[PDB]
Enzyme design. Structure first.
Site, PDB file in Angstrom:
ATOM      1  CG  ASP A 198      -2.043   1.000   1.072  1.00  0.00           C
ATOM      2  OD1 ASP A 198      -2.199   1.547  -0.057  1.00  0.00           O
ATOM      3  OD2 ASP A 198      -2.725   1.301   2.081  1.00  0.00           O
ATOM      4  NE  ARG A 236      -3.989   5.224   0.599  1.00  0.00           N
ATOM      5  CZ  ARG A 236      -3.743   5.010  -0.696  1.00  0.00           C
ATOM      6  NH1 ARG A 236      -3.634   6.012  -1.559  1.00  0.00           N
ATOM      7  NH2 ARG A 236      -3.511   3.769  -1.117  1.00  0.00           N
ATOM      8  CG  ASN A 237      -0.047   4.364   3.687  1.00  0.00           C
ATOM      9  OD1 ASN A 237      -0.628   4.681   4.727  1.00  0.00           O
ATOM     10  ND2 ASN A 237      -0.550   3.482   2.821  1.00  0.00           N
ATOM     11  CG  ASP A 267       0.847  -0.274   5.981  1.00  0.00           C
ATOM     12  OD1 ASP A 267      -0.165   0.214   5.437  1.00  0.00           O
ATOM     13  OD2 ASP A 267       1.005  -1.502   6.061  1.00  0.00           O
TER      14      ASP A 267
END
Ligand SMILES: Cn1cc(-c2n[nH]c3ccc(NC(=O)c4ccc(NC(=O)Nc5cc(C(F)(F)F)ccc5F)cc4C(F)(F)F)cc23)cn1
Ligand SMILES: [Cl-]
Length: 299
Positions: free
Chosen positions: A154, A158-159, A172
């Protein structure tokens, strides 16, 4: 003995100040942490207080702290340890004052002006040099993880977190923030797929390898040079699966020079083994990040 892997912090050394964020499995606070770093009697930290689903939350907590402790490294989110003396269980992280890279990019986008400047960052839109420095650091984090043969699954802006001085580190959040619900496609049993960041072999065959992380990174690069736009934002989730599986490629961002767009395209080779190595991708972005202004000028 996960116990013995992880560092522990005394509860009395943590002083909560106010909440930073909230999800199903706990709240995140900004906090003071005392006697944690030698030359700091007091520093700010972000603390996660586990809202407990009992034996499974406890075990996931211990597994996550162990993993984070193993992976500590320059461009990985800094984790200081746990507080298991009493409840709630706490996880203690470095505080990253700009927050997540997606939000940081959107607030220094092509519309920003004098007001958006700060202690850390020039007014207006991030310049090519700063965009490349952000990309180089994230790719450095993925070199380290690929070095460990760790797959993220992922990777997305945004992470990643942005600290003072525009230091960027990969984390994460585990699909936990309402503002990024749109970045996930919901399948059976509230399974969430970040399809817009996934390569075709992930979508089609449910495979995710280090080579799928280089494709994801290419989408991260595109996010960075669009100032945080969602990939395939003009498409629904199923249209995005169709475009990705049928070979459609993200358009070059306006702020993206053709040389950097070639780096993205190299990440998006259809066959995983034809993709460039993340080590090579990092090396090229570092070369560009460190280049003199004379060179960057003519990109
Ligand atoms: C202005 N502002 C600043 C901040 C801020 N600063 N520092 C912060 C630290 C945490 C949070 N918030 C989180 O939710 C948060 C974010 C990340 C983590 N764990 C995580 O990445 N694990 C992990 C990483 C990797 C990888 F990627 F390293 F390979 C592989 C496997 C993994 F399991 C846990 C939380 C948790 F708290 F839930 F625990 C916010 C801030 C917020 N707002
Ligand atoms: Cl999330």
């Amino acid at each position: 003995f996960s116990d013995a892997c992880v560092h522990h912090i005394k509860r009395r050394d943590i002083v909560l100040k106010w909440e930073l964020g909230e999800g199903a499995f706990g709240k995140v606070f900004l906090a003071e942490c005392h006697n944690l770093l030698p030359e700091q009697d007091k520093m700010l930290v972000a603390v996660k207080a586990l809202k407990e689903a009992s034996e499974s939350a406890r075990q996931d907590f211990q597994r996550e702290a162990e993993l984070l402790t193993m992976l500590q490294h320059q461009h990985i989110v800094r984790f200081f340890g746990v507080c298991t003396e009493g409840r709630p269980l706490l996880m203690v992280f470095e505080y990253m004052r700009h927050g997540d890279l997606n939000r940081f990019l959107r607030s220094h986008g092509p519309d920003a002006k004098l007001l958006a400047g700060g202690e850390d960052v020039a007014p207006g839109p991030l310049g090519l040099g700063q965009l490349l420095a952000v990309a180089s650091q994230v790719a450095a984090g993925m070199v380290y993880l690929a070095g460990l043969h760790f797959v993220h699954r992922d990777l997305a802006t945004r992470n990643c977190l942005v600290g003072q001085g525009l230091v960027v580190k990969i984390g994460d959040f585990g699909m936990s923030r309402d503002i990024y619900s749109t970045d996930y496609y919901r399948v059976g049993g509230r399974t969430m797929l970040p399809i817009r960041w996934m390569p075709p072999e992930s979508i089609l065959y449910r495979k995710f390898t280090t080579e799928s992380d280089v494709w994801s990174f290419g989408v991260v690069l595109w996010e960075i040079f669009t100032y945080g736009k969602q990939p395939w934002y003009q498409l629904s989730n199923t249209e995005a699966i169709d475009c990705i599986t049928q070979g459609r490629e993200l358009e070059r961002p306006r702020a993206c020079p053709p040389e950097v767009y070639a780096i993205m395209r190299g990440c998006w080779q259809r066959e995983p083994q034809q993709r460039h190595s993340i080590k090579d991708v990092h090396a090229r972005l570092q070369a560009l990040a460190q280049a003199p202004p004379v060179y960057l000028d003519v990109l």
